[PDB]
């Protein structure tokens, strides 16, 4: 058997759940997993296609095998943690800065 | 764009996404492929910083 070469039609003993949006939860479409926020996308695909890449050769949007809609994938891993302190001699207070 | 093309390569394996290799190979047996991906990315980081 092959892996990630054709739309799902066999699979196994795995029941399907519901669809949640605006959340950075895990997803699985035709065996391909990942992590990202499922939002709306104005771009449309093709009837004889399924997956979709981009300039960075990454999975940005995958067609749902039930609703047949377009949902863009946006990972929430975007940001940093910083802290600015005036020194331990002046005062013992800091300020958390978000990147 | 050079570092973007390196992430999609296999570096002697069969896939590039870490969530795809672990879903098909167990960690006790996939250790021979994860080490090649980490080492194959450290060469691009040392070349980019140079």
């Amino acid at each position: 058997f092959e892996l990630l070469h054709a739309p799902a039609t066999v699979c196994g003993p795995k029941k399907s759940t519901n669809l949640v949006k605006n959340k950075c939860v895990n997803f699985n479409f035709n065996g391909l997993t990942g992590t990202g926020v499922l939002t709306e996308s104005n771009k449309k695909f093709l009837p004889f296609q399924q997956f979709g890449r981009d300039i960075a050769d990454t999975t940005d949007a995958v067609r749902d095998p039930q609703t047949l809609e377009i949902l863009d994938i946006t990972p929430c891993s975007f940001g940093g943690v910083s802290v600015i302190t005036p020194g331990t001699n002046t005062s013992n207070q800091v300020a958390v800065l978000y990147q | 764009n050079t570092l973007v093309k390196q992430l999609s390569s296999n570096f002697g394996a069969i896939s590039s996404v870490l969530n795809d290799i672990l879903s098909r190979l167990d960690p006790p047996e996939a250790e021979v492929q994860i080490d090649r991906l980490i080492t194959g990315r450290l060469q691009s980081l040392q070349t980019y910083v140079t």
Binding site: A56, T58, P75, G80 | V4, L7
Partner: peptide
Amino acid sequence: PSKRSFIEDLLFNKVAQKFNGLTV
């Protein structure tokens, strides 16, 4: 609108990645 001269404004018109670890 900006505090620049006509020469500085003329040369100004001529002159996804962070998800992979390429922050700017």
